Amino acid sequence: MENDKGQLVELYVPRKCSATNRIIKADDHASVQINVAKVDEEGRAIPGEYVTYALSGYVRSRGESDDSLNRLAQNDGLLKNVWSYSR
């Protein structure tokens, strides 16, 4: 969102849930920012280099947070043969 001259307004741009594509509000205290280590040969998790997922507090209350990360991480190559599209 911007004015006529392209100057930015709207003092912050909010995070969005990576499962349901909805806005994380400033008062969603059940929302969670998952940080996953990136790894290289012979283990040795690289410090400070992540794969990050955000989950809204709606999803976690519904009990869908586990099934969401199984989809969210299998599509990124973090898992294999754990989440199945066809139920």
Partner 1 sequence: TRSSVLADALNAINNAEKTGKRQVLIRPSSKVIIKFLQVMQKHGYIGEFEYIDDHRSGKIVVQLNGRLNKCGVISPRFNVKIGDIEKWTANLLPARQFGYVILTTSAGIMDHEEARRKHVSGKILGFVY
Partner 2 sequence: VLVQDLLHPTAASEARKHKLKTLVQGPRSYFLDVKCPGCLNITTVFSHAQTAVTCESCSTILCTPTGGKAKLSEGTSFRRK
Partner RNA sequence: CUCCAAUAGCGUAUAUUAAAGUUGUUGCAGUUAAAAAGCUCGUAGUUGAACUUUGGGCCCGGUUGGCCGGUCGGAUUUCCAACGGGGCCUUUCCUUCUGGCUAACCUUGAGUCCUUGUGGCUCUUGGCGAACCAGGACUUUUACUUUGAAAAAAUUAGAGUGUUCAAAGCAGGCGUAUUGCUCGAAUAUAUUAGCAUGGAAUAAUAGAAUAGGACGUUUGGUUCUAUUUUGUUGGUUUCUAGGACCAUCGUA
Partner RNA sequence: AAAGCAUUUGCCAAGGACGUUUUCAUUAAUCAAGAACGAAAGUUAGGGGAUCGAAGAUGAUCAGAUACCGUCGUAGUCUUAACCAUAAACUAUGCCGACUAGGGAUCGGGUGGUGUUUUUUUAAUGACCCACUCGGCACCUUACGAGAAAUCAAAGUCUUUGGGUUCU
Contacts with partner 1, residue ranges (CB under 8 A): 19-22, 58-59, 62, 64
Quick one: tokens of 48?
Answer: 């400070």
Q: Does 81 bind partner 2 (CB under 8 A)?
A: no
Q: Does 15 bind partner 2 (CB under 8 A)?
A: no
Kindly tell me which residue out of 28, 58, 71, 78 binds RNA, with binding defined by CB under 7 A: 58
Contact 36, 51 (CB under 8 A): yes
Q: Select 38 or 62, whichever has its Cβ closest to RNA.
A: 62
Residue 64 has, within 13 A of its CA and on its CB side, a CA count of: 14
Sign of CA dihedral 43, 44, 49, 52: positive
Q: Which is nearer to RNA, 36 or 64 (CB)?
A: 64
Q: Is residue 59 exposed (0-12), middle (13-18) or buried (19+ Cβ within 10 Å)? A: buried
Site membership for partner 2, residue 12 (CB under 8 A) = no
| Residue 61 binds partner 2 (CB under 8 A) | no
* List of residues contacting RNA (CB under 7 A): 58, 61-62
